[PDB]
Design a binder for this molecule. Structure first.
Ligand SMILES: Cn1ccc(C(=O)NC[C@@H]2CCCO2)n1
Ligand SMILES: Cn1ccc(C(=O)NC[C@@H]2CCCO2)n1
Ligand SMILES: Cn1ccc(C(=O)NC[C@@H]2CCCO2)n1
Ligand SMILES: [Zn+2]
Ligand SMILES: [Zn+2]
Ligand SMILES: [Zn+2]
Ligand SMILES: [Zn+2]
Lengths: 69, 69
């Protein structure tokens, strides 16, 4: 029904929000520290000097294990 | 249809996986460092000396800003 299409769209949008903002292909699993923005996969987070969201200096990257993974 | 019910169940399970594993009421927004398990809201994470998934000592809690929030 039309309700099935509405739920499919909500599911798709939630799943897309869990994907890396740089490559759009891999799951987010890395946090820029200390700012806390958690928006990249490990490969994309590895060479960034500053956060792509807030421009804060990246002191290090923390790997995250999420129950949605 | 029956697919509306199946999609409603998938959406609910994905949303539940984003909720704190301890209080079951607030969104996950905190990482236990250094292990990386990201399973709690800030209130439950502040009260735990050991990670509830792997039992490693919590050296500190990193707040995470996620696009799914
Ligand atoms: C971050 N974001 C939003 C939407 C998408 C997306 O549709 N990406 C396409 C690829 C194809 C294989 C994995 O997703 N990514
Ligand atoms: C008979 N039954 C048991 C569970 C459901 C169900 O989840 N229905 C889908 C709902 C209706 C509102 C849109 O999603 N139906
Ligand atoms: C972690 N988790 C799994 C399922 C649930 C759950 O159903 N929680 C109930 C509360 C009521 C207000 C917010 O969710 N939580
Ligand atoms: Zn990436
Ligand atoms: Zn940032
Ligand atoms: Zn909690
Ligand atoms: Zn742990």
């Amino acid at each position: 029904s039309q309700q099935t299409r509405v739920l499919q769209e909500k599911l798709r949008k939630l799943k897309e929000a869990m994907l890396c903002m740089v490559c759009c292909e891999e799951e987010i699993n890395s946090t820029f520290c200390p700012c806390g923005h958690t928006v990249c996969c490990e490969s994309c987070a590895a060479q960034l000097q500053s956060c792509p969201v807030c421009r804060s200096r990246v002191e290090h990257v923390q790997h995250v294990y999420l129950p949605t993974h």
